[PDB]
């Protein structure tokens, strides 16, 4: 696959092969390029084969592959081609969720500035605010509150984001909640 998607020229001589290629994860060439950070291949793969919202065996689109591998250049190119920033994998996690889980700060801000939903929920009812609180992403908590995230939301555990921050000992996050509550 790599040699076939190494450049526009390679892509054009392997069109038939690439058009219906799927690997063991049911991934398209586009998803593979996204994982590998082959920024040069993205636009031509999209223009030729589309499939922006096709999902692999975990329910991940190409944008999920880019985000979980912190490929900011790729994610930028996908959003300008029309990728859905609020896609969900089969666990109900969105790109913003993944960026919070892995602590990819720049990616998180980019996703939020490109329409990532601040209130979406995964299957266990966690919102981005709850996930950022549990993972101790204190600047992301601050940003989500600034963007109007619902502080009152509760997940499967019945706890709010702030209560979850206390359970997980996230002092800076707790400090953000306190500053917010005061002001």
From Swiss-Prot:
Key words of the record: ANK repeat, Repeat
Residue spans of the ANK repeats: 25-54, 58-87, 91-120, 124-153
SUPFAM superfamilies: Ankyrin repeat (SSF48403)
Family matches, as InterPro entries: Ankyrin_rpt, Ankyrin_rpt-contain_sf
Keyword presence, Mitochondrion: no
Protein name: Putative ankyrin repeat protein TV1425
């Amino acid at each position: 696959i790599v040699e076939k998607i190494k450049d526009e020229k390679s892509i054009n001589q392997n069109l038939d092969f690439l058009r219906n290629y799927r690997d063991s994860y049911n991934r398209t060439p586009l998803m593979v390029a996204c994982m590998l950070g082959m920024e040069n291949a993205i636009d031509k793969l999209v223009e030729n084969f589309d499939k922006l919202e096709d999902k692999d065996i975990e329910g991940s689109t190409a944008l999920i592959w880019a985000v979980k591998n912190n490929r900011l250049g790729i994610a930028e190119k996908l959003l300008s081609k029309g990728s859905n920033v609020n896609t969900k994998d089969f666990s109900g996690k969105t790109p913003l969720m993944w960026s919070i889980i892995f602590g990819y700060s720049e990616m998180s801000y980019f996703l939020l500035e490109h329409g990532a939903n601040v209130n979406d929920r995964n299957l266990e009812g966690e919102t981005p605010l709850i996930v950022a609180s549990k993972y101790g992403r204190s600047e992301i908590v601050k940003k989500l509150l600034e963007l109007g995230a619902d502080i009152s939301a509760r997940d499967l555990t019945g706890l709010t984001a702030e209560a979850s921050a206390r359970i997980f000992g996230r002092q800076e996050v707790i400090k953000i909640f306190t500053e917010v509550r005061r002001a």
